[PDB]
Design a protein around this ligand. Structure first.
Ligand SMILES: [Fe+3]
Length: 307
């Protein structure tokens, strides 16, 4: 049996854990919490950690653990199961990206078409969109978007975009609230994550939704994908089973279990999501270095500077 520190959505973790237990008979105990807290705890616990695997919604969480020498090598063959072009790879082969979530533009298709959409996410923060673009400044993925803009286009462009959103955007407290605002005709478009829309479409039926998604693609900063993944702890005294679990997460069966439970993009190219997601390769995500704590502090300062 194994213990998995779980930073991922609990529905996803419970689903892959159940599928693993059903496939192998090896029991999984989830210790679910915030990834940044769990990462800190793994570092503090060091050689004495009871964690066999760390399963997270953000692979950036692994960088500090890897550099601290706390992660075990995983099989090159396993890593290759999800190593599509664009997918982040552990330089030390000590973690694996498994799935992703995408930034997206959601829009009211009864007011707008794709003709009204923009080439770049940068262009939504302009006077055309005054009173007409929803954004969620307190959102984690929004912050990742700001980090990506700074990295890809520089701070001035990132700050200009944020100032553009202050001037032109409508602020929403959460992504769910922004999605509902678009559905309800309050605002014609909003910047959110893919999974909110696909979840609503699955529950209510797309025929009953006024909103649709627009993907900028073309490696635009707005095509940003955030990657979930897993790593085995070096300190684990149950390497064989921990490696078996990570191998399972990258397997067709494990990926199928994940995508049935959560509207993330699988990184195997022989698994199809029941949520009706496009293939990961079609997204044309940009390649962006992992977010560090320093990146986040810098992005937070830009948000504050923009008002
Ligand atoms: Fe969310």
């Amino acid at each position: 049996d194994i213990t998995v520190y779980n930073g991922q959505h609990k529905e996803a973790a419970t689903a892959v854990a159940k599928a693993f237990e059903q496939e192998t008979g090896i029991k999984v105990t989830l210790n679910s919490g915030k990834s940044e807290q769990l990462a800190g705890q793994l570092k503090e616990e060091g050689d004495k950690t009871p964690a066999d695997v760390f399963y997270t919604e953000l692979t950036a969480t692994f960088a500090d653990l890897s550099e601290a020498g706390l992660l075990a090598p995983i099989s090159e063959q396993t890593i290759q199961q999800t190593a599509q072009k664009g997918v982040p790879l552990a330089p030390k082969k000590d973690w694996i990206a498994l799935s992703g979530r995408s930034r997206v533009v959601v829009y009211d298709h009864t007011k707008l078409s794709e003709k009204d959409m923009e080439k770049s996410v940068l262009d939504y923060a302009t006077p055309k969109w005054k009173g007409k673009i929803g954004y969620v400044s307190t959102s984690g993925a929004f912050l990742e978007q700001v980090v990506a803009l700074s990295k890809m286009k520089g701070d001035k462009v990132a700050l200009n975009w944020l100032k553009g959103l202050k001037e032109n955007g409508k602020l929403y407290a959460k992504n769910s609230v922004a999605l509902q605002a678009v559905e309800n005709g309050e605002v014609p478009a909003a910047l959110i994550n893919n999974y909110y829309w696909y979840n609503l479409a699955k529950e209510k039926g797309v025929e009953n939704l006024k909103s649709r998604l627009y993907f900028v693609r073309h490696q635009d900063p707005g095509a940003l994908v955030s990657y979930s993944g897993a790593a085995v702890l070096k300190a684990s005294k149950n390497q064989a089973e921990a490696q078996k679990f990570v191998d399972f997460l990258a397997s067709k069966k494990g990926q199928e279990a994940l995508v049935a439970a959560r509207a993330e993009y699988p990184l195997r190219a022989d698994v199809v999501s029941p949520f009706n997601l496009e293939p990961y390769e079609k997204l044309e995500a940009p390649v962006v270095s992992a977010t560090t704590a320093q990146d986040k502090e810098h992005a937070i300062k830009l948000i504050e500077e923009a008002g």
